[PDB]
């Protein structure tokens, strides 16, 4: 048989340590797909070498390792081992603490097609070794827990290899990786599929005159949007009259109704719209003074 056929995908997250002078580094990798593992994975090995210092090695039986690094630059390697031998290594530079990330991807966009969420960008002008893509759902009913994947340096379009949901807003971040460290990240929001909002805006009067009323409302919580809100519509009518409808820019949170009749009972509601349709909020009432 054969040893594993490629290095695992390999990345890290870094934070300040409780110990002065150190950084807590969470090294992470993905279990190779079975076709690349070529047999039972026995374990992994990480090495860490600080510039002009002694190499540290760790045997790991898991897909994550937490280490304490100084503020210096490190070379990190990861190999996966099976009964036959060791894979080629995944290699990263973990830069010194004064490292300035530059050279982000340009023209980042994301869009659904064929039931996958595609992400594409213009390649940076530098030689990219590989890319890290990260994503999480934006929601007030669940924290942003990231999943991630790795791409070869020649890639400029790919799809997220997760099993995603419709009507959820994904925050997607693309980071180029260079020989000397990560590039600066860029992020975009996108939906695998949009739907009409689950709730409409709740409208209230700020001020009411004989012939005008100032309305205001809070923006919809992201969770209930189910897509990018493109615009609102205000519908209003005298108690005895026909309905009037006026469109409102999605970036606004106030609007003045005009040409109102004095001494009159008004009923009013608003709807919010995504590309897929709209949803009415609750009806509200006010009476103009005489
Ligand atoms: Cl991956
Ligand atoms: Cl965006
Ligand atoms: Cl008025």
Curated annotation (Swiss-Prot):
| Cysteine pairings via disulfide bonds | 136-144
Domain Fibronectin type-III spans what residues? 7-102, 104-195, 196-290
* Domain of life of the source: Eukaryota
The tissues where this chain's protein is expressed are given as:
Found in all the tissues and cell lines examined. Expression not restricted to IL6 responsive cells.
- Glycan attachment residues as annotated in the record: 57, 61, 68, 231, 242
Induction record: LIF and OSM activate the type I OSM receptor while only OSM can activate the type II OSM receptor.
Q: What does its UniProt record remark on the domains? A: The WSXWS motif appears to be necessary for proper protein folding and thereby efficient intracellular transport and cell-surface receptor binding.
- How does the record describe its quaternary structure? Component of a hexamer of two molecules each of IL6, IL6R and IL6ST; associates with the complex IL6:IL6R but does not interact with IL6. Forms heterodimers composed of LIFR and IL6ST (type I OSM receptor) which are activated by LIF and OSM. Also forms heterodimers composed of OSMR and IL6ST (type II receptor) which are activated by OSM but not by LIF. Component of a receptor complex composed of IL6ST/GP130, IL27RA/WSX1 and CNTFR which interacts with the neuroprotective peptide humanin. Interacts with HCK. Interacts with INPP5D/SHIP1. Interacts with SRC and YES.
Specify the protein name. Interleukin-6 receptor subunit beta
Source species, please?
Homo sapiens (Human)
Task: Describe which stretch of the whole protein the shown chain covers, with first residue, last residue and complete length.
Answer: 323 to 612 of 918
């Amino acid at each position: 048989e054969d040893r594993p056929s490629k290095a695992p995908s390999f990345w890290y997250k870094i934070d300040p340590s409780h110990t002065q002078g150190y950084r807590t580094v969470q090294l992470v990798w993905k279990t190779l797909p079975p076709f690349e593992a070529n047999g039972k994975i026995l374990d992994y090995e990480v090495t860490l070498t600080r510039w002009k210092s002694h190499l540290q090695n760790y045997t790991v039986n898991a897909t994550k390792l937490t280490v304490n690094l100084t503020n210096d630059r490190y070379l990190a390697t990861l190999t996966v081992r099976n009964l036959v031998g060791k894979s080629d290594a995944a290699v990263l530079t973990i830069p010194a603490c004064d490292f300035q990330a530059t050279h982000p991807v340009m023209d980042l966009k994301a869009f659904p097609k064929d039931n996958m969420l595609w992400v594409e960008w213009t390649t940076p002008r530098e030689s990219v070794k590989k890319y890290i893509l990260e994503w999480c759902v934006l929601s007030d009913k669940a924290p942003c827990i990231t999943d991630w994947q790795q791409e070869d340096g020649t890639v400029h379009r790919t799809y997220l290899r997760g099993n995603l949901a419709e009507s959820k807003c994904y925050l997607i971040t693309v980071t180029p990786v260079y020989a000397d460290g990560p590039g600066s990240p860029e992020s975009i929001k996108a939906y695998l599929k949009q739907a009409p909002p689950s709730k409409g805006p709740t409208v209230r009067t700020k001020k009411v005159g004989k012939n005008e009323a100032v309305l205001e409302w809070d923006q919809l919580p992201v969770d209930v949007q189910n897509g990018f809100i493109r615009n609102y519509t205000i519908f209003y009518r005298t108690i005895i009259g026909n309905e009037t409808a006026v469109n409102v820019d999605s970036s606004h949170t106030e609007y003045t109704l005009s040409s109102l009749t004095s001494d009159t009972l008004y009923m009013v509601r608003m709807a919010a719209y995504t590309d897929e349709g709209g949803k009415d909020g609750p009806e509200f009432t006010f009476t103009t003074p005489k």
